[PDB]
Amino acid sequence: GTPPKSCSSGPVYCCNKTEDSKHLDKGTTALLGLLNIKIGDLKDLVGLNCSPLSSCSAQTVCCTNTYQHGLVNVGCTPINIGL
Ligand code: NA
Numbered sequence: 335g336t337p338p339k340s341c342s343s344g345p346v347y348c349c350n351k352t353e354d355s356k357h358l359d360k361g362t363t364a365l366l367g368l369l370n371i372k373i374g375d376l377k378d379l380v381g382l383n384c385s386p387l388s389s390c391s392a393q394t395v396c397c398t399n400t401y402q403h404g405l406v407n408v409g410c411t412p413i414n415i416g417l
Contacts, residue, residue: 344386344400347386347396347397347407348384348394349382349404351381352379355378355408378409378411381408381410386404394413394415395413397409397411398410
């Protein structure tokens with residue numbers, strides 16, 4: 335029948351690291367600048383080195399956008415796909 339659903343949009347991502355969009359470190363801010371992502375328009379979390387799931391030992395999040403094969407994700411919120 336219906337398949338299981340979690341994120342309203344996109345797949346569940348497994349991200350090595352997540353950061354508050356309003357407290358990014360200087361390295362992450364620079365990388366986003368390099369990608370021409372406008373930081374002031376971001377909400378929630380930024381994920382770095384993210385891959386979509388179809389098991390994750392790091393952070394499982396739902397994101398609005400993924401860039402450069404998951405180097406950076408934006409609009410990410412924590413999600414719990416377990417019990
Ligand atoms: Na762990």
